[PDB]
C-alpha cells in the first residue's frame, strides 16, 4: 500500500490512548486538594513558574499528542460552565479509561462500555439529587461558623477561632441581595478590610458599614453631621489645566 503516512489500528491504539491520557492525570495527581504540592512549569525561554493550582497547570501543560489534547479542551468547558472543578474531571476520566482498558483485554467490546457509562452517569445524578441539602441554616444553626473556622486554621488567626469566625459569618449574610426575581447571590465585591494598631488582635470590631481610610484635615469643621446628601465628584477644585 502507498499512502501519505503511517497507519495503525487495533487494540494497540486503545492502549496507547489510555497511557497518554493517564500520564496527564499524574501531572494533576499530587496537586489535588488544599494541601496540593507545587510543580515546576519549565518554559521554552528558560525561566520556570512555581504554580500549585491545577487550573493553571493544564493551561501551561503542552503535550503534542492527540490523546492528551482531548483533555485540554475540558478545562475550557469547566470554567465557562461553573468556574471550578477542573482537575477532578481529569483524574476521574483517566481512571475511567484505565479501568475500561482492562475490559478490552477481558474480551468486552467498548460499545457496551459506552452505553453502560451513560446509564451509570445518569443514575449518579439521581442518587446525588436524592441526598442533597437545601441552602439554609444561615442563622441560629451552625454548619457555618464551623465551616469558615476550618479555612482559618492555617494562619496565625486560628488561635482565637470563635472570635474571628463571627466577623465573617455576619459579613456574608449582610451582602445578600436578590436583585433578580429572588436569586439571591453574593457579589464579587465584599467588605473593605482595613487595619490599625489596637495594641492586640482582640480589639477588632464588626462595623455595619463602609469605612474610608481618609483624614478630613481641619478640626474647626464639625465631625458629626445629620443631613443625608452625599456629593461625589472627580473634577479637581484646585487650579485646572487643559491637558497634561
Amino acid at each position: 500500500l502507498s499512502v501519505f503516512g503511517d497507519r495503525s489500528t487495533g487494540e494497540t491504539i486503545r492502549s496507547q490512548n489510555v497511557m497518554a491520557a493517564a500520564s496527564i492525570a499524574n501531572i494533576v495527581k499530587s496537586s489535588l486538594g488544599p494541601v496540593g504540592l507545587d510543580k515546576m512549569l519549565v518554559d521554552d525561554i528558560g525561566d520556570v513558574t512555581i504554580t500549585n493550582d491545577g487550573a493553571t497547570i493544564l493551561k501551561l501543560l503542552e503535550v503534542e499528542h492527540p490523546a492528551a489534547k482531548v483533555l485540554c479542551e475540558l478545562a475550557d468547558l469547566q470554567d465557562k460552565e461553573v468556574g471550578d472543578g477542573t482537575t477532578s474531571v481529569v483524574i476521574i476520566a483517566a481512571e475511567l479509561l484505565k479501568n475500561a482498558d482492562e475490559l478490552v483485554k477481558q474480551k468486552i467490546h467498548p460499545t457496551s462500555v459506552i452505553s453502560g457509562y451513560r446509564l451509570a452517569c445518569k443514575e449518579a445524578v439521581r442518587y446525588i439529587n436524592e441526598n442533597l441539602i437545601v441552602n439554609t441554616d444561615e442563622l441560629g444553626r451552625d454548619c457555618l461558623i464551623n465551616a469558615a473556622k476550618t479555612s482559618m486554621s492555617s494562619k496565625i488567626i486560628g488561635i482565637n477561632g470563635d472570635f474571628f469566625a463571627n466577623m465573617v459569618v455576619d459579613a456574608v449574610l449582610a451582602i445578600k441581595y436578590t436583585d433578580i426575581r429572588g436569586q439571591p447571590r453574593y457579589p464579587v465585591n465584599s467588605v473593605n478590610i482595613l487595619k490599625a494598631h489596637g495594641r492586640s488582635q482582640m480589639e477588632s470590631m464588626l462595623i455595619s458599614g463602609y469605612a474610608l481610610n481618609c483624614v478630613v484635615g481641619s478640626q474647626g469643621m464639625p465631625k458629626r453631621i445629620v443631613n443625608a446628601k452625599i456629593a461625589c465628584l472627580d473634577f479637581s477644585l484646585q487650579k485646572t489645566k487643559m491637558k497634561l
Binding site: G5, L74, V82, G85
Partner: protein
C-alpha cells in the same frame, strides 16, 4: 453492562485515594473508612449509621460534613461527572490512527 457500572464505581474511588495520599495517611485505611460508613446508610435506615461522612485531611480521621461545614455546590459535582464520562467516551471511540 454489569461490568461497565461496577468499574464505574471503582473509578470514582480515586478521589478519596488521591486525597488520602496527599494527607500523609494510609490510603488503604482512610478510603475504606469512608465506604464502611456509607454502606451502613444503605443497609438499614437506623440513626446509629453514620451519614454524610466527609474526609478531614488534617487529622487523618473521617468526620461528618454537617458538623464540620464542608460543603460543595451541586453544579460543580453534577457537571464533573457529566463532562468526565463524555470525555472518556470520545477517547474510547478511537480505533484507528491516520497521520499525514
Amino acid at each position: 453492562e454489569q461490568l461497565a457500572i461496577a468499574e464505574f464505581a471503582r473509578s470514582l474511588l480515586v478521589i478519596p485515594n488521591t486525597l488520602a495520599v496527599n494527607a500523609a495517611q494510609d490510603s488503604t485505611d482512610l478510603v475504606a473508612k469512608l465506604r464502611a460508613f456509607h454502606n451502613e446508610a444503605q443497609v438499614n435506615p437506623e440513626r446509629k449509621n453514620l451519614k454524610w461522612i466527609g474526609l478531614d485531611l488534617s487529622n487523618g480521621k473521617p468526620r461528618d460534613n454537617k458538623q464540620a461545614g464542608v460543603f460543595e455546590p451541586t453544579i460543580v459535582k453534577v457537571k464533573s461527572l457529566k463532562f468526565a464520562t463524555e470525555a472518556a467516551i470520545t477517547i474510547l471511540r478511537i480505533d484507528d490512527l491516520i497521520k499525514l
